[PDB]
C-alpha cells in the first residue's frame, strides 16, 4: 500500500539515513539495530510488518 | 503458550484458550442489544458477501420461545448448536414445570451448557457470544452469555467488530426511559456506527421483545427503521 | 524418527517401520525350524540355555492332539496367543466335535494379529510362529508374523542365525516330500545344527522337537526322549 | 503460525479455526465446478466431468446424487468423502421420512448435513469431511430452492452459486447475470449455467465432459439430463 | 512437562497447578467474612465496573444455600456458578435424606472432597475457586469457613480473599476485635477493610454487595443488603474517619 | 521410543521392561536352592532401623502349607502378586481338591503379570522365587516382570545378584543334603552380601514334601549362630 | 527415557513420581507416634493458630473406627479423602465381617488403596503418609506406618514429616527396650520430642491417648503441660 | 514433515499426504489386473515366492468374497486378508437380511465406506491396499468395481493395481474387451502379466486367475489352468 514507500520517500527528502529490518528476522539483534542507528544521528529505523514480535503478551511456554 | 490444551492452567492462573475463544468473538459480525423501558431490542448485521446469497432465506435473530429472542456474534454453526440446545432446554422446562421459562432461568441454563463445553482435553468451547432478550412476569430482561460459561446483565451492550465504538455510543446516547421506537432507533444507529457499508432491508435484521410477545422484525420493517429514518 | 512411533502412522516410503521393528524383535528370538512330509509334519526349536543349573526354556507348545507350535519372540505374546488357540480348538470341538483344521486356525491367528497393527497405542504381536498339523486335507506347516501375514511352507526357519538353516531346508526340500518320519526328523535336527556356531551342536539341552503325523498325536519330545533321536545321528566334523 | 493448526479444536490468537479453512482447500478438487442456478420454476445444477483415463466406466464416475423423489444433490470434494457425505444424506432422509411420514425439506437437509459437519468441527474425535454439497428442491407452492452446504457447518440459499475451480470468476459471472434484469425460464436457467461453465473454463465442452441435474415445478422429479439433452443445450448456446 | 498436567508433582513434591489456581484467586474481587458474635456477615464488594451493568439480581457474589447457610465466590465465574449449584444439590441431598439442616463442617467437607476428587484425576482441570461459608447448625452454630482449590478447608472467625487479600487479613489482625465484637461492629470493620483495600475514595454503594445471617425466631434469616443501609454504613465510616481526624 | 511397551526399538527390544529388570536390581537380594531333601529360600531384610518390627517387612512369605516365596524389587506390588498366588491356590484347591503344581502357581502369577499392554498399566517391577513341594516332585521356580519364568536349581535375584549367583553356582551339586546347602548359602550371604548372621535382617524358609506345617525358620537360629 | 510420568521407568527402573510423592510427604509438619507397654500416645505439633484461625476446625487428629485414630501428614485434601474412605471401610467391615475390625486389616486397606490409585495413568498418588495406632491386636498395642508408595510397616515408635530425620534418631537414642512402665512415662517421653521438634513452645502438642482397651482419649493443653513440666524436671537434673 | 502425521488432520495443501502414503504402500506390491469380457469378469494376479522353502500355492492373493463375488488385491497382504473378512461379513449380512444376493454396487460402496471411515479416526490408519471386486448377475448384467485406500470406488472395463498401474493399463487398452469373451480373455491376461516384467529382475513368481461368468455359472471359481496350460504356453511364448 505504500507503508515502506512513503518512509523511503521521507528518508530521501530529509537528511536521514534509512535502516530497515523486517519482523520475521534475538534481543541482541534489536540492540545492534539501535546501536547502528546511534552511529548516524539523523538516521531512521524501520520495522517492517512488526506484528510477529509485538503480538499480545501472555504466559509463554517454550 | 498454554492454548493448545484447554484443561490446564497457566502460571498466572489464566485459561488462555477461552480468551482465544473470546478473541474469535468480536471478530464476527457486529451486533447490539439494548433494554428499553418497555421492550428489548437486538439488532445485527446481515450483509450478503455477494448478490448470490439470498437475504430473505437466512436469519440470525432466532425466537427460542414466543417470549425469548437470541442474537449472536460468532461463527454460525456453534450458534446453531446452542440454539437447538436452548430450544430443547426451554421445552423441557415447559414439560417439567408446565410454565413458560423465565429469561434468567433459560440464560443460566445456556450458560451452564457453554460451561460444560469448557473442560476436557479433546473439545473446544463455542466461539460465540450471545444476547438473550426476554419478558418475565412483566419485566424485560437482557442478558449476555459468553464462551467462558459466565453471563452478565446489561441494559445495553454490543459486540462484534467495532464493539468498543458500540460501548461508547450506548454510553453517550442512552437512557433507560427510552420508548420502544426510540430504542429501535438507537439500535439501528449503533449498528450503523459499528457498521461499514450500506444498510437497507436486505442488510440488517432486528428482533424486539415486548411483554405480550417477542418477534423478529421483517426486512421491510428493518428498512422502515433503517431507511427514511435516521 | 518422525514417522516411527506407532503403527497407525505411515512412512513416506509406503511402509510402517514399527511393523518392521516387530519383525526385528521376532528375529531376536532363537532359531526354529519346521518341515513336513507326506507322512508327518515336524517342528524343532533351539531352547536357549540360561545357566548350567537352570531349565532350558521351552520353545515348543502343545495345544491340540493334532496341532503344535514353535515360537520365536517375546514369550508373553506367544504364550497368550497359545491360550487363544486353546480357546478356539476347544470351542470348535465343543461346536462340532471336529479337530480344528490347521489352515483356518492360522488364518484366524493372522486376522486377530492384524487388529493391533492398525490401531493406536497397542503393540502388534512381536512373535513369529511355526505351526504344524495334520488334517482331512493334508499335512500343514505355517508361519505367522507380527505383520499378521501367514504363509504355508514345506520348509521354513525363523529366528536368529536362521539363514544357514533356511538354505539347508531349501536344499533338502527336494527330499522332504516323500521322506519318512525318521528321515524328516533327522533332517530337521541337522537344519537346526546349521544355525549354531562351530562349537555349539545338537544336545538335549538346546533341542526340542514336536511331531504330528497321520498315525500319531502331536507330541513334544524333550530331555530323555531327545536322546534316542540324537544318538545314531552323524556328529559334526571340522 | 504453527501450533494452532495441528489439531482441530484449537482457537488461534485471532480466534481462527485453522483446520476449517484448511479443509476448505480440498473443496477445490480440480475438475468440478458445480454451478447451480434458480429460475422462476426450476432449479439447475451442472458439474464439470473431468475423466482422466478412458477405461473407467462413465456411469461410475458420476458426482450427482438423489435423496428424495423431489430432491437433487451434487458434490464437489474428495470422492470418498463425497460418497460418505451423500450416504449420511440418505441416512438422514430415510430417518426423517420414517419419523415424520413425509420426506425431508431441502433446507432442513442442508441444516442436518451442516450440523454433522459442525459436529466434527467442534469435536476432535473425527476429521471434518472435506467436501461441499449442493441441493436443489421444491417447497409447496412457494418455490424452488438451491442450497449450499459446507464442511465448516455453514449453509445458505441462493439465487445461484458455484463452488468450483474458477471460484471467483464463476461467482462474479453469475452475479453479473443476475445484476442485470431478465426473466428465468428452464432453458434460460440452463443456458446461464452452461454459459458460466464454458466462459470460466474456456473449453469447447464436448457432451461427456459435463453432467447436469435438474428439478422443475411442472415435473418435480429430480433428473440427471441425458447426453442428448445436454448436447441440445450445448448447440442451443453455441448457435 | 510437569505443570502441563494435574497428575504430576514437583521433584520437591509440590503441585504447581493448585498454586496457579490461588494465583488466579489473587485476581478476584475483594470479599471477606468478618468477625462477629450473635450474628455473622460475608461482605463482598462487586468488582464489576460499568454503569451499563444492570445487576438485576442485586447479588452476584453471595449465594444463599439455605436460610441458615450462605457462601461467597472468589475465582473462576462458570466454575463458581456450577460449584454453588452443586452446593445446593448436596445440601438438598442431605436435607432430603435426614429432613435436618446440614452441619456447616459436613457440607464444607463434602464439597471440598468433591473438588479434590476432580483435581486428582487426570484429563480434568482443578477448580480455580476459593470461597467462604457462613452458617448456623446444631453442633456449632455461627461458623465461617475458608476453602481453596485443592479441596482444603479451615475455620476462620474473620478472613478475606481476592485483591489485596494479604493486606486485608493483616489489618484485620492489626485491629482484631473479640468478644463484645457483635454484628454491628463487624459491619463497621467490614466498611473499614473495604475502604482500605479498595482504591476508591468515598466508596460507592453499588460497588459493594453485603450479606449477613442473624438468628430470628430460631429459624434464622439471611439478608442481602439493599442500597439504603449500605449508604448509611459507608457514610458513617466516612464521618468516623473525620472524627478520627478531629483528635488532631 | 520412551513412552511405554507399545513402542519397538530398531533392534526390536521394548525400552520399558529392561528398566523393570533394573528395578529388580535395586531390590534386596534373595536366594533359592532346590534339593531332593527340601526346597529353601533366603532373603535380606535391609531393616532400616531395628525400631521397626523386622517381621513387618514381608520379604519372605508363605503362599500355602506346601509353597513359600521370596521377592526382590519395588516390593509394593510383589505383595499383590503373593495375594494373587494365594487366591490361586485357594480357588484351585477348593474347586478341584488336587494340589496346585508350583509350576501352575507360577503360570497363574505370570498370567496376572501380562496385564500392562495385553488388554484393552506398567510391568510389575519385581522378581520372585517360589519354593514348593508336590506329589510328583520338590521344585523351585523363578519369575520376572516380563512374565517369563524358569525352573532353577540355585537362583539369586536383586542387588548383588551376579556375585551371589556365581558363588551359589560354584557350591551347588545335584546330591547335596539340605543342611549343607543351607550352610553354604548362609556363609555365602555372610561373605558377599552384608555381614554376620542375625535374626533381625536375615530370613530363611524351607519346605519338605511330608511337612505341611512350619514352612519357616523362627526362634531357633541360635544353634547356627554358635555353630556357623 | 526420563521420569516425566507416573507409569514409566527411567533406565535405573525406579518410579521417580513415587519419590516426588515421598518428598511431598517430607514437606509436611512433624508427626511422631509410638506404642507403649499397654497404651499408644500421639502428639502433633506446628498448630500455628493465627488468631481468627480457631485450631479445632482443621482437626489435626481424626479417630475413624469404634477405636482407631490418625490424620495424615502431607497435603490435607488427600488426608481427608482417605479419612472418608477409612470411615466407609471400617464401618462396612464391622457390619459385614463376622468379627470387628483389626488394625492390621485397615492398614493393609489404606496401603492397597494408595497402591491401586497410584498404579494407573492420569491418577495422582496420595502424597500422604500416616501412623496408625490400634487396640485389637488381640488386646495389645501396635503401631503401623503407611507410605505413598502404598507400603505399610510395623514400628514400636516412628516419626514422619519435617522431623523424620531428627525425631527418629531421637527415638534411636532413647526408645527404651524396657517396656515403658507407667505409660504416662511414655507420654512424657513422646511429649518431649513433640515439643522439642517445634521449638518446644508448649502450645502445639495436640495429643491423643488410647490404652488399647479404651475408646479415644484426648489431652487438653494444660494436662499435656503437666507431662511437659515433668519432662522439664527430668531434664533439669543435670546440676 | 509439516502436519502430515495422522489421517485426521488436513495437512498443508489440504491433501492429507497420509492416505497418499497408503497409496505409496500399494505401489510397492506386485501387479493385479481385472477385465470384464462380454459375459464375465476375470482377474489375474502375480505373487512373489518366498524361496525354495515356500510351499507351492501358499499365501495366495485371490480371495473369495461370496459364492458369486470374487476379489483381487494389491498392497499390504494382511490388510487385504482383513478386508476380505469384512467383505465376506457384509455379503453375509445382505444375504441374510434381504433374502437374495447383493448387487455388487452396494457391497462395493459399503466396503468403500469401511475403508474411508477407517481413514478418518485418529486412533486408526487408512488401509494400505487397493482392490477389485467382480461378479455377474444373470438377471441383468456383469459388474466390476475398484477401490483405493481413500475409499474411492469406480468401475472399469479393464483395471490394474500394483507396481505397474499405467503400464498395465497401456497393455489392456489395445485389447478388444468391448466384445471379446472370457475364454481367450484368460490367455490375454496371462500374457499381459508376463509382458510386464515376468521374471526380468524378480527371479520367480506364481500366477493365479479368478473368474466369474455366465459360462462359469456366474459364481466365483479359480480358473482350471491345469487343463492343457494354454494360457501358460501363451504367456511364455510372449518371450518375443
CATH number of the domain enclosing E145: 3.60.20.10
Report the alpha-carbon distance of residue C159 to residue C157 in Å, rounded: 7
Cβ burial H20-39 (10 Å sphere, 16+ → b, else e): bbbbbbbeebbbbbbbbbeb
Number of domains in chain D: 1
The CATH number of H1-238 is 3.60.20.10
The DSSP letter of residue A43 is: -
- Could you tell me the residue range of the domain that residue D220 belongs to? 1-239
The DSSP annotation for C215-226 comes to TEEEEEE-GGGH
Phi, psi of E233 (to 5 degrees): -65, -45
List Cα–Cα distances, G28 to E151, G22, H235, in angstroms. 17, 10, 85
Report the alpha-carbon distance of residue C185 to residue C221 in Å, rounded: 11
Q: Which residues contact B63 (CB under 8 A, 6 or more apart)?
A: B69, B70, B207, B214, B215, B216
Residue B1: how many CB atoms within 10 A of its CB? 16
CB contact under 8 A, D118 and B57: no
Pinpoint the alpha helices (H) of H66-214. 77-98, 104-120, 165-173, 182-195
CB contact under 8 A, G127 and E13: yes
The DSSP annotation for E35-60 comes to --SSEEE--EE-----TTB--TTS-S
User: Taking a C-beta distance cutoff of 8 angstroms, is the pair B13, E27 a contact?
Assistant: yes
Residues 42-61 of C with CB under 8 A from F: 50-55, 57
Domain harbouring G132, CATH code: 3.60.20.10
Beta A44-48 vs D71-77: how paired, if at all?
unpaired
Residues of H in contact with D60 (CB under 8 A): 145, 153-155
Judged by a CB distance cut-off of 8 A, whether residue C158 touches chain H is no
Residue of G nearest to F16 (CA): G9
User: Which pairs with CB-CB distance under 8 Å and at least 24 residues apart come from F217-226?
Assistant: F221/F197, F224/F186, F224/F197, F225/F197, F225/F198
C-alpha angle D137-D141-D142 in degrees, rounded to nearest 5: 70
Report the alpha-carbon distance of residue D108 to residue D102 in Å, rounded: 13
In 3D space, the residue among C72, C53, C49, C48 whose CA is nearest the CA of residue C61 turns out to be: C72
User: Taking a C-beta distance cutoff of 8 angstroms, is the pair B88, D187 a contact?
Assistant: no
Report the alpha-carbon distance of residue C202 to residue C193 in Å, rounded: 6
Residues facing H205 on adjacent strands: H48
Report the alpha-carbon distance of residue H1 to residue G223 in Å, rounded: 74
The DSSP letter of residue E3 is: G
Closest Cβ opposite residue E78 in set B10, B149, B157: B149
Q: Do chains C and G touch (3 or more CB pairs under 8 A)?
A: no
In 3D space, the residue among B123, D9, G79, G24 whose CA is nearest the CA of residue E123 turns out to be: B123
Q: Which residues contact B108 (CB under 8 A, 6 or more apart)?
A: B151, E81
CB contact under 8 A, E23 and B11: yes
Residues of E in contact with G52 (CB under 8 A): 35, 156-159, 172-173, 176
Residue of B nearest to E7 (CA): B8
Sign (positive or negative) of CA dihedral G119, G123, G129, G133: negative
Closest Cβ opposite residue H173 in set D25, D55, D57: D55
In 3D space, the residue among F163, F73, F149, F167 whose CA is nearest the CA of residue F110 turns out to be: F149
Domain harbouring D64, CATH code: 3.60.20.10
Residues of C in contact with F147 (CB under 8 A): 75-76
Judged by a CB distance cut-off of 8 A, whether residue A55 touches chain B is no
Burial of residue E6 (number of CB atoms within 10 Å: 0-12, 13-18, 19+): buried
Report the alpha-carbon distance of residue D46 to residue D136 in Å, rounded: 11
User: Residue E131 is inside which H or E element, if any?
Assistant: strand E129-135
SS3 assignment, position G44: strand
CB contact under 8 A, C53 and F169: yes
In 3D space, the residue among C143, C148, C134, C61 whose CA is nearest the CA of residue C100 turns out to be: C134
User: Residue E111 is inside which H or E element, if any?
Assistant: helix E104-120
Q: Which residues of A make up each annotated binding site?
A: 1-4
- The residue written with cell numbers 470387628 in the block is G100
Report the alpha-carbon distance of residue D162 to residue D177 in Å, rounded: 13
SS3 assignment, position H95: helix
Residue G69: how many CB atoms within 10 A of its CB? 23
- The residue written with cell numbers 524328516 in the block is C184
User: Taking a C-beta distance cutoff of 8 angstroms, is the pair E44, E210 a contact?
Assistant: yes
List Cα–Cα distances, B62 to B80, C186, G209, in angstroms. 10, 86, 70
- The residue written with cell numbers 467462558 in the block is B148
User: Taking a C-beta distance cutoff of 8 angstroms, is the pair B138, B34 a contact?
Assistant: no
* Cell numbers describing residue G36: 507403649
Report the alpha-carbon distance of residue G6 to residue F163 in Å, rounded: 32
- Could you tell me the residue range of the domain that residue F60 belongs to? 2-228
Rg (CA), chain H: 18
Report the alpha-carbon distance of residue E84 to residue E131 in Å, rounded: 10
Beta H62-66 vs B204-210: how paired, if at all?
unpaired
Report the alpha-carbon distance of residue A31 to residue A27 in Å, rounded: 6
* Cell numbers describing residue H172: 489392456
- Chain B nearest-CA distance from D155, in A, is 9
- The residue written with cell numbers 422484525 in the block is B217
Q: Which residues of E138-220 form beta strands (DSSP E)? A: 143-147, 153-155, 159-161, 208-209, 211-214
Report the alpha-carbon distance of residue H114 to residue H118 in Å, rounded: 6
Q: Which residues contact F137 (CB under 8 A, 6 or more apart)?
A: none
User: Taking a C-beta distance cutoff of 8 angstroms, is the pair E39, E182 a contact?
Assistant: yes
Closest Cβ opposite residue G54 in set E120, E157, E173: E157
The number of C-beta contacts closer than 8 angstroms across C and F is 77
Q: Do chains H and E touch (3 or more CB pairs under 8 A)?
A: no
Domain harbouring F158, CATH code: 3.60.20.10
The 3-class SS string of chain D reads: CCCCCCCCCCCCCCCCCHHHHHHHHHCCCCCCCCEEEEECCEEEEEEECCCCCCCECHHHHCCEECCCCCEEEEEEECHHHHHHHHHHHHHHHHHHHHHHCCCCCHHHHHHHHHHHHHHHHHECCCCCCCEEEEEEEEECCCEEEEEEECCCCCEEEECEEECCCCHHHHHHHHHHHHCCCCCCCHHHHHHHHHHHHHHHHCCCCCHHHEEEEEEECCEEEEEECCHHHHHHHHHHHHC
Q: Which residues of A make up each annotated binding site for ATP?
A: 1-4
Residue of B nearest to D35 (CA): B52
Q: Which residues of chain G form beta strands (DSSP E)? A: 31-35, 40-44, 68-69, 130-134, 142-147, 151-155, 157-160, 207-210, 217-219
Amino acid at each position: 500500500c505504500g507503508k515502506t514507500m512513503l518512509a523511503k520517500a521521507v528518508a530521501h527528502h530529509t537528511t536521514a539515513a534509512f535502516i530497515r529490518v523486517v519482523g520475521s528476522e534475538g534481543p541482541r539483534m534489536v540492540r545492534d539495530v539501535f546501536r547502528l542507528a546511534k552511529e548516524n544521528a539523523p538516521a531512521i529505523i524501520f520495522i517492517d510488518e512488526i506484528d510477529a514480535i509485538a503480538t499480545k503478551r501472555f504466559d509463554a511456554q517454550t | 503458550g498454554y492454548s493448545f490444551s484447554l484443561t490446564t492452567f497457566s502460571p498466572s492462573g489464566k485459561l488462555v484458550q477461552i480468551e482465544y475463544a473470546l478473541a474469535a468473538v468480536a471478530g464476527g459480525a457486529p451486533s447490539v442489544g439494548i433494554k428499553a423501558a418497555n421492550g428489548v431490542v437486538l439488532a445485527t448485521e446481515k450483509k450478503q458477501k455477494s448478490i448470490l446469497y439470498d437475504e430473505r432465506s437466512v436469519h440470525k435473530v432466532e425466537p427460542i420461545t414466543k417470549h425469548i429472542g437470541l442474537v449472536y456474534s460468532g461463527m454460525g454453526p456453534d450458534y446453531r448448536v446452542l440454539v437447538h440446545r436452548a430450544r430443547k432446554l426451554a421445552q423441557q422446562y415447559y414439560l417439567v414445570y408446565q410454565e413458560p421459562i423465565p429469561t434468567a432461568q433459560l440464560v443460566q441454563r445456556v450458560a451452564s451448557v457453554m460451561q460444560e463445553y469448557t473442560q476436557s482435553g479433546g473439545v473446544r468451547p463455542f466461539g460465540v457470544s450471545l444476547l438473550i432478550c426476554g419478558w418475565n412476569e412483566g419485566r424485560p430482561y437482557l442478558f449476555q452469555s459468553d464462551p467462558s460459561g459466565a453471563y452478565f446483565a446489561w441494559k445495553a451492550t454490543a459486540h462484534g467488530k467495532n464493539y468498543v465504538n458500540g460501548k461508547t455510543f450506548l454510553e453517550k446516547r442512552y437512557n433507560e426511559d427510552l420508548e420502544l421506537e426510540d430504542a429501535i432507533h438507537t439500535a439501528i444507529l449503533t449498528l450503523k456506527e459499528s457498521f461499514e457499508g450500506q444498510m437497507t432491508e436486505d442488510n440488517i435484521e432486528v428482533g424486539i421483545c415486548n411483554e405480550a410477545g417477542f418477534r423478529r422484525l421483517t426486512p421491510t420493517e428493518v428498512k422502515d427503521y433503517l431507511a427514511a429514518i435516521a | 524418527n518422525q514417522y516411527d512411533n506407532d503403527v497407525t502412522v505411515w512412512s513416506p516410503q509406503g511402509r510402517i517401520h514399527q511393523i518392521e521393528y516387530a519383525m526385528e524383535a521376532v528375529k531376536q528370538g532363537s532359531a526354529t525350524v519346521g518341515l513336513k512330509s507326506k507322512t508327518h509334519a515336524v517342528l524343532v526349536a533351539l531352547k536357549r540355555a540360561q545357566s548350567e543349573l537352570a531349565a532350558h526354556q521351552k520353545k515348543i507348545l502343545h495345544v491340540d492332539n493334532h496341532i503344535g507350535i514353535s515360537i520365536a519372540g517375546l514369550t508373553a505374546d506367544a504364550r497368550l496367543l497359545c491360550n487363544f488357540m486353546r480357546q478356539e480348538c476347544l470351542d470348535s470341538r465343543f461346536v462340532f466335535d471336529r479337530p480344528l483344521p490347521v489352515s483356518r486356525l492360522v488364518s484366524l491367528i493372522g486376522s486377530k494379529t492384524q487388529i493391533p497393527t492398525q490401531r493406536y497405542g497397542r503393540r502388534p504381536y512381536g512373535v513369529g510362529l511355526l505351526i504344524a498339523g495334520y488334517d482331512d486335507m493334508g499335512p500343514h506347516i505355517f508361519q505367522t508374523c507380527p505383520s499378521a501375514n501367514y504363509f504355508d511352507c514345506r520348509a521354513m526357519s525363523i529366528g536368529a542365525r536362521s539363514q544357514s538353516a533356511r538354505t539347508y531346508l531349501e536344499r533338502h526340500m527336494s527330499e522332504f516330500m516323500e521322506c519318512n518320519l525318521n528321515e524328516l526328523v533327522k533332517h530337521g535336527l541337522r537344519a537346526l545344527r546349521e544355525t549354531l556356531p562351530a562349537e555349539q551342536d545338537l544336545t538335549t539341552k538346546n533341542v526340542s522337537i514336536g511331531i504330528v503325523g497321520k498315525d500319531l498325536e502331536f507330541t513334544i519330545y524333550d530331555d530323555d526322549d531327545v536322546s534316542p533321536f540324537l544318538e545314531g545321528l552323524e556328529e559334526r566334523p571340522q | 503460525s504453527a501450533g494452532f493448526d495441528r489439531h482441530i479444536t484449537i482457537f488461534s490468537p485471532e480466534g481462527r479455526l485453522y483446520q476449517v479453512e484448511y479443509a476448505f482447500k480440498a473443496i477445490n478438487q480440480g475438475g468440478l465446478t458445480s454451478v447451480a442456478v434458480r429460475g422462476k420454476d426450476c432449479a439447475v445444477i451442472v458439474t464439470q466431468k473431468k475423466v482422466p483415463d478412458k477405461l473407467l466406466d462413465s456411469s461410475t464416475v458420476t458426482h450427482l446424487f438423489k435423496i428424495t423423489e423431489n430432491i437433487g444433490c451434487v458434490m464437489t470434494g474428495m470422492t470418498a468423502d463425497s460418497r460418505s457425505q451423500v450416504q449420511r444424506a440418505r441416512y438422514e432422509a430415510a430417518n426423517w421420512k420414517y419419523k415424520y411420514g413425509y420426506e425431508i425439506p431441502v433446507d432442513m437437509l442442508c441444516k442436518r448435513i451442516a450440523d454433522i459437519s459442525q459436529v466434527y468441527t467442534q469435536n476432535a474425535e473425527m476429521r471434518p469431511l472435506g467436501c461441499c454439497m449442493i441441493l436443489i428442491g421444491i417447497d409447496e407452492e412457494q418455490g424452488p430452492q438451491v442450497y449450499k452446504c459446507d464442511p465448516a457447518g455453514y449453509y445458505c440459499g441462493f439465487k445461484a452459486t458455484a463452488a468450483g475451480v474458477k471460484q471467483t470468476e464463476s461467482t462474479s459471472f453469475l452475479e453479473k447475470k443476475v445484476k442485470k434484469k431478465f426473466d428465468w425460464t428452464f432453458e434460460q436457467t440452463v443456458e446461464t449455467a452452461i454459459t458460466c461453465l464454458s466462459t470460466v473454463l474456456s473449453i469447447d465442452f464436448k457432451p461427456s465432459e459435463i453432467e447436469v441435474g435438474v428439478v422443475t415445478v411442472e415435473n418435480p422429479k429430480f433428473r440427471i439430463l441425458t447426453e442428448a439433452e445436454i448436447d441440445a443445450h450445448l448447440v442451443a448456446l453455441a448457435e | 512437562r510437569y505443570d502441563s498436567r494435574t497428575t504430576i508433582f514437583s521433584p520437591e513434591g509440590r503441585l504447581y497447578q493448585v498454586e496457579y489456581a490461588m494465583e488466579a484467586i489473587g485476581h478476584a474481587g475483594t470479599c471477606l467474612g468478618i468477625l462477629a458474635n450473635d450474628g455473622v456477615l460475608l461482605a463482598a464488594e462487586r468488582r464489576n465496573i460499568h454503569k451499563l451493568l444492570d445487576e438485576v439480581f442485586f447479588s452476584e457474589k453471595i449465594y444463599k444455600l439455605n436460610e441458615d447457610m450462605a457462601c461467597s465466590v472468589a475465582g473462576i465465574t462458570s466454575d463458581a456458578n456450577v460449584l454453588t449449584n452443586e452446593l445446593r444439590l448436596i445440601a438438598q441431598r442431605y436435607l432430603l435424606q435426614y429432613q435436618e439442616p446440614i452441619p456447616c463442617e459436613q457440607l464444607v467437607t463434602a464439597l471440598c472432597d468433591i473438588k479434590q476428587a476432580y483435581t486428582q484425576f487426570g484429563g480434568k482441570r482443578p477448580f480455580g475457586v476459593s470461597l467462604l461459608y457462613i452458617g448456623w447448625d446444631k453442633h456449632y452454630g455461627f461458623q465461617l469457613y475458608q476453602s481453596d482449590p485443592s479441596g482444603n478447608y479451615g475455620g476462620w472467625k474473620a478472613t478475606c480473599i481476592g485483591n489485596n487479600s494479604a493486606a486485608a487479613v493483616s489489618m484485620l489482625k492489626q485491629d482484631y476485635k473479640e468478644g463484645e465484637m457483635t454484628l454491628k461492629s463487624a459491619l463497621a470493620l467490614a466498611i473499614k477493610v473495604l475502604n482500605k483495600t479498595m482504591d476508591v475514595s468515598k466508596l460507592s454503594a453499588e460497588k459493594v454487595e453485603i450479606a449477613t445471617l442473624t438468628r430470628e425466631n430460631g429459624k434464622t434469616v439471611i439478608r442481602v443488603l439493599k442500597q439504603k443501609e449500605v449508604e448509611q454504613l459507608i457514610k458513617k465510616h466516612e464521618e468516623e474517619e473525620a472524627k478520627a481526624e478531629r483528635e488532631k | 521410543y520412551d513412552r511405554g511397551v507399545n513402542t519397538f526399538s530398531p533392534e526390536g527390544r521394548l525400552f520399558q521392561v529392561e528398566y523393570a529388570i533394573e528395578a529388580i536390581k535395586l531390590g534386596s537380594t534373595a536366594i533359592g536352592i532346590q534339593t531332593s531333601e527340601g526346597v529353601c529360600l533366603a532373603v535380606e531384610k535391609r531393616i532400616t532401623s531395628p525400631l521397626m518390627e523386622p517381621s513387618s517387612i514381608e520379604k519372605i512369605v508363605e503362599i500355602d502349607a506346601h509353597i513359600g516365596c521370596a521377592m526382590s524389587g519395588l516390593i509394593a506390588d510383589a505383595k499383590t502378586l503373593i495375594d494373587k498366588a494365594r487366591v490361586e491356590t485357594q480357588n484351585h484347591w477348593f474347586t478341584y481338591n488336587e494340589t496346585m503344581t508350583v509350576e501352575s502357581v507360577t503360570q497363574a502369577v505370570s498370567n496376572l503379570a501380562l496385564q500392562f499392554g495385553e488388554e484393552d498399566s506398567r510391568p510389575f517391577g519385581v522378581a520372585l522365587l517360589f519354593g514348593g513341594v508336590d506329589e510328583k516332585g520338590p521344585q523351585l521356580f523363578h519369575m520376572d516382570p516380563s512374565g517369563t519364568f524358569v525352573q532353577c536349581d540355585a537362583r539369586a535375584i536383586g542387588s548383588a545378584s551376579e556375585g551371589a549367583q556365581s558363588s551359589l553356582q560354584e557350591v551347588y551339586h545335584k546330591s547335596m543334603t539340605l543342611k549343607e546347602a543351607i550352610k553354604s548359602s548362609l556363609i555365602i550371604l555372610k561373605q558377599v552380601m552384608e555381614e554376620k548372621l542375625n535374626a533381625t535382617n536375615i530370613e530363611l524358609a524351607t519346605v519338605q514334601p511330608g511337612q505341611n506345617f512350619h514352612m519357616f525358620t523362627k526362634e531357633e537360629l541360635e544353634e547356627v549362630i554358635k555353630d556357623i | 527415557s526420563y521420569d516425566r510420568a507416573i507409569t514409566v521407568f527411567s533406565p535405573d527402573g525406579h518410579l521417580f513420581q513415587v519419590e516426588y510423592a515421598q518428598e511431598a510427604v517430607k514437606k509436611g509438619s512433624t508427626a511422631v507416634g509410638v506404642r507403649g507397654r499397654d497404651i499408644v500416645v500421639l502428639g502433633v505439633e506446628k498448630k500455628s493458630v493465627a488468631k481468627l484461625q480457631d485450631e479445632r476446625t482443621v482437626r489435626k487428629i481424626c479417630a475413624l473406627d469404634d477405636n482407631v485414630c490418625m490424620a495424615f501428614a502431607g497435603l490435607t485434601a488427600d488426608a481427608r479423602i482417605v479419612i472418608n474412605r477409612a470411615r466407609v471401610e471400617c464401618q462396612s467391615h464391622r457390619l459385614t465381617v463376622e468379627d470387628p475390625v483389626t488394625v492390621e486389616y485397615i492398614t493393609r486397606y489404606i496401603a492397597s488403596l494408595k497402591q491401586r490409585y497410584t498404579q494407573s495413568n492420569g491418577r495422582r498418588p496420595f502424597g500422604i503418609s500416616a501412623l496408625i495406632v490400634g487396640f485389637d491386636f488381640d488386646g495389645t498395642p501396635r503401631l503401623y506406618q503407611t507410605d505413598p508408595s502404598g507400603t505399610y510397616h510395623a514400628w514400636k515408635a516412628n516419626a514422619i514429616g519435617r522431623g523424620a530425620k531428627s525425631v527418629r534418631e531421637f527415638l534411636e537414642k532413647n526408645y527404651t527396650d524396657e517396656a515403658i512402665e507407667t505409660d504416662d512415662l511414655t507420654i512424657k517421653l513422646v511429649i518431649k520430642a513433640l515439643l522439642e521438634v517445634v521449638q518446644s513452645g508448649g502450645k502445639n502438642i495436640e495429643l491423643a491417648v488410647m490404652r488399647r482397651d479404651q475408646s479415644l482419649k484426648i489431652l487438653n493443653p494444660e494436662e499435656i503441660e503437666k507431662y511437659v513440666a515433668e519432662i522439664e524436671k527430668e531434664k533439669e537434673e543435670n546440676e | 514433515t509439516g502436519y502430515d502425521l495422522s489421517a485426521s488432520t488436513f495437512s498443508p495443501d489440504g491433501r492429507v499426504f497420509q492416505v497418499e502414503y497408503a497409496m505409496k504402500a500399494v505401489e510397492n506390491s506386485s501387479t493385479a489386473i481385472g477385465i470384464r469380457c462380454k459375459d464375465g469378469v476375470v482377474f489375474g494376479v502375480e505373487k512373489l515366492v518366498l524361496s525354495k522353502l515356500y510351499e507351492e500355492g501358499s499365501n495366495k492373493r485371490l480371495f473369495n468374497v461370496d459364492r458369486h463375488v470374487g476379489m483381487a488385491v494389491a498392497g499390504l497382504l494382511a490388510d487385504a486378508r482383513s478386508l476380505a473378512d469384512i467383505a465376506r461379513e457384509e455379503a453375509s449380512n445382505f444375504r441374510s437380511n434381504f433374502g437374495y444376493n447383493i448387487p455388487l454396487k452396494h457391497l462395493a460402496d459399503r466396503v468403500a465406506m469401511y475403508v474411508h471411515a477407517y481413514t478418518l479416526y485418529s486412533a486408526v490408519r487408512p488401509f494400505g491396499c487397493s482392490f477389485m471386486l467382480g461378479s455377474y448377475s444373470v438377471n441383468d448384467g456383469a459388474q466390476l468395481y475398484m477401490i483405493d485406500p481413500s475409499g474411492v470406488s469406480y468401475g472399469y472395463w479393464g483395471c490394474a493395481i500394483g507396481k505397474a498401474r499405467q503400464a498395465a493399463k497401456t497393455e489392456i487398452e489395445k485389447l478388444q474387451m468391448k466384445e471379446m469373451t472370457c475364454r481367450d480373455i484368460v490367455k490375454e491376461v496371462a500374457k499381459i502379466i508376463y509382458i510386464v516384467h515376468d521374471e526380468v529382475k524378480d527371479k520367480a513368481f506364481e500366477l493365479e486367475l479368478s473368474w466369474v461368468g455366465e459360462l462359469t455359472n456366474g459364481r466365483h471359481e479359480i480358473v482350471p489352468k491345469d487343463i492343457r496350460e494354454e494360457a501358460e504356453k501363451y504367456a511364455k511364448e510372449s518371450l518375443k
